Amino acid sequence: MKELIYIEEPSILFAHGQKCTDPRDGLALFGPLNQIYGIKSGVVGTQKGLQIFKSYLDKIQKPIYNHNNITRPMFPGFEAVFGCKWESQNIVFKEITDEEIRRYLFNASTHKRTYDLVTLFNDKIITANKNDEERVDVWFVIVPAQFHDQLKARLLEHTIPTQILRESTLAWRDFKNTFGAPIRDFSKIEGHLAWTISTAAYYKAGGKPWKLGDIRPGVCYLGLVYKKIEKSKNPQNACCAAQMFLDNGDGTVFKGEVGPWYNPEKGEYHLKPKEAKALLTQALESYKEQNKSYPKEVFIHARTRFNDEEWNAFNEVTPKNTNLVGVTITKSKPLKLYKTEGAFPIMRGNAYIVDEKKAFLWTLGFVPKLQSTLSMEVPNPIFIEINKGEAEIQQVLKDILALTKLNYNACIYADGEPVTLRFANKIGEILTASTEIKTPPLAFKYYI
Amino acid sequence: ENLSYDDINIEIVRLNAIDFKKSWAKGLQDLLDAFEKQNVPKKPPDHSKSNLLYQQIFLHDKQAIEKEETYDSNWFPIISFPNELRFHRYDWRLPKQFDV
DNA sequence: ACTAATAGATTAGAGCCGTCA
RNA sequence: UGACGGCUCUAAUCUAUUAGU
Ligand SMILES: [Mg+2]
Numbered sequence: 001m002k003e004l005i006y007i008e009e010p011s012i013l014f015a016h017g018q019k020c021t022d023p024r025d026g027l028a029l030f031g032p033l034n035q036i037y038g039i040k041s042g043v044v045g046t047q048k049g050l051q052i053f054k055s056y057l058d059k060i061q062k063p064i065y066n067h068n069n070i071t072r073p074m075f076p077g078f079e080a081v082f083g084c085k086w087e088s089q090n091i092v093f094k095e096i097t098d099e100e101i102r103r104y105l106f107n108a109s110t111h112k113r114t115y116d117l118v119t120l121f122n123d124k125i126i127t128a129n130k131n132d133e134e135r136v137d138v139w140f141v142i143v144p145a146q147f148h149d150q151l152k153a154r155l156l157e158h159t160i161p162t163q164i165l166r167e168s169t170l171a172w173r174d175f176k177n178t179f180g181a182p183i184r185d186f187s188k189i190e191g192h193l194a195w196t197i198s199t200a201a202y203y204k205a206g207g208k209p210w211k212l213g214d215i216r217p218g219v220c221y222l223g224l225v226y227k228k229i230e231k232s233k234n235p236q237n238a239c240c241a242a243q244m245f246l247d248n249g250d251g252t253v254f255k256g257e258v259g260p261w262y263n264p265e266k267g268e269y270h271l272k273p274k275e276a277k278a279l280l281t282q283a284l285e286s287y288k289e290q291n292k293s294y295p296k297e298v299f300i301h302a303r304t305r306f307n308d309e310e311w312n313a314f315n316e317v318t319p320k321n322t323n324l325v326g327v328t329i330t331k332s333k334p335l336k337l338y339k340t341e342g343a344f345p346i347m348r349g350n351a352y353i354v355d356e357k358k359a360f361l362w363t364l365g366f367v368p369k370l371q372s373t374l375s376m377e378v379p380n381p382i383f384i385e386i387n388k389g390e391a392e393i394q395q396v397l398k399d400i401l402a403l404t405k406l407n408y409n410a411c412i413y414a415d416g417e418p419v420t421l422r423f424a425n426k427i428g429e430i431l432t433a434s435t436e437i438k439t440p441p442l443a444f445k446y447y448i
Numbered sequence: 449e450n451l452s453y454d455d456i457n458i459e460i461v462r463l464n465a466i467d468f469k470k471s472w473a474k475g476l477q478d479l480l481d482a483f484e485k486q487n488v489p490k491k492p493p494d495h496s497k498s499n500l501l502y503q504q505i506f507l508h509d510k511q512a513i514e515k516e517e518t519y520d521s522n523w524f525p526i527i528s529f530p531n532e533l534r535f536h537r538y539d540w541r542l543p544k545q546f547d548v
Numbered sequence: 549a550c551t552a553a554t555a556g557a558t559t560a561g562a563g564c565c566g567t568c569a
Numbered sequence: 570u571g572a573c574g575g576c577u578c579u580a581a582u583c584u585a586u587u588a589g590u
Binding site for chain 1 (some may be wrong): 570571572573574575576581582583
Binding site (some may be wrong): 016020021025 | 471472473499500502503506507509510511512516517519520521522
């Protein structure tokens, strides 16, 4: 019988310094922030893949609409939303061998066949980069098994952007099953898939669609994720870390402090002191050099709870007064509510408080402007708590709700969890394919 | 909005329609409503329009109403609890390997 | 000191489905 | 890897209680 607390929905920035709520709504309204026109593209693969990719590229030029448009807005032409020239008449194409030098059946060794295929693709791409004369930005690899991890890891050392597309994506019309019916039906999301592909291509080309300008100056945010690596001793180290929003000349810095600080244990997860201070110093020095000053507040995200001696080590790191506050987030607590009447769920934005520390937040539900729900069944909320430090309880709630929009890999209205942990997790698996790299690149476009 | 609303113009004071400090889409909606109520001459939509007739406004119908509602939870409460619990040690009430 | 069992409570990996009547 | 969510199973450490030596 306790009342709930609603929190407003922060807005994003767009061209000419305006604001909106749905990113694609603003895109159709104004468009991007910065200007990018270099989309000279190259494609490698077989004849069928090249032909279908060219057909798709000439198809995307005209506007298209989905089955229902009250939820998903209209998709105009690509020149009519961003402003560029994307065409199939300026593509550099190369042909993979038509015959197979790797046996068709995965009988000898599936790992060996995957390594051979990635070796062939990597060598062809490197020869193309180091031999030819043209200038290219992206590469749209068609595929006729944990493959792309190795390819991204092996292409990391050459600093070339890339993207992967599967053959089953485009030819769903004639890709019938064994009974003659199509396996996949994309007669409902074609506009949104076009939106996502265009946004991903524009980001990879070197252009940011939207930024943020309603954040408190002088504060910086951090996140940590943990993953297991299993070679001989199964030593779980991870510590891939994430990005940070250090203030600058009216921008949104998103570089991430990377480098898997080794933690040599099999069951211990939290942290070790020397790696802790190394990580914190590496995170802090970038702010120190960029802002030529010192931060006033440090915020730490965590996906799991952490020990105490790490905080003992971190206490001396605080230069003068910049106290660091560390919080934890989970993803599963059974509190499935039900609306008293009708057949409709609850809406996102409501928060629940049990004390000064714990809190339940609902980032899944419905939004009236979409008229529908983000989830299929009744949504379930998430839990937040300030593990270490003292801060206002609604501050972290509104902050964690604020960071649920910077999802550059898609264009959904909102996402389940904040992206600070999401991007760290995303880079985690692809960095661990081969850890023989020293000082990896810090930009967030090479890693997807 | 840097200029004060005082010195707008000498021969415009009697007229007041709209400002644009807030945003640029709700203003479009207001101007469209004004043109409709004053009956600006109509133009054919070529049977392809009226799709824009939804997102041309800044928000479709998103608002903040204060009407109250109730929700049914999933937990079940307990009112009465036993006062005490008992404690003992005899060490051969049952066979050791025998389970409890 | 550690290898056997007891259960509660955290934690991460993978593998299946629908696509919003 | 288009992208999201909702589910299922498998396993694993940290406490705290035993008895074999
Ligand atoms: Mg992606």
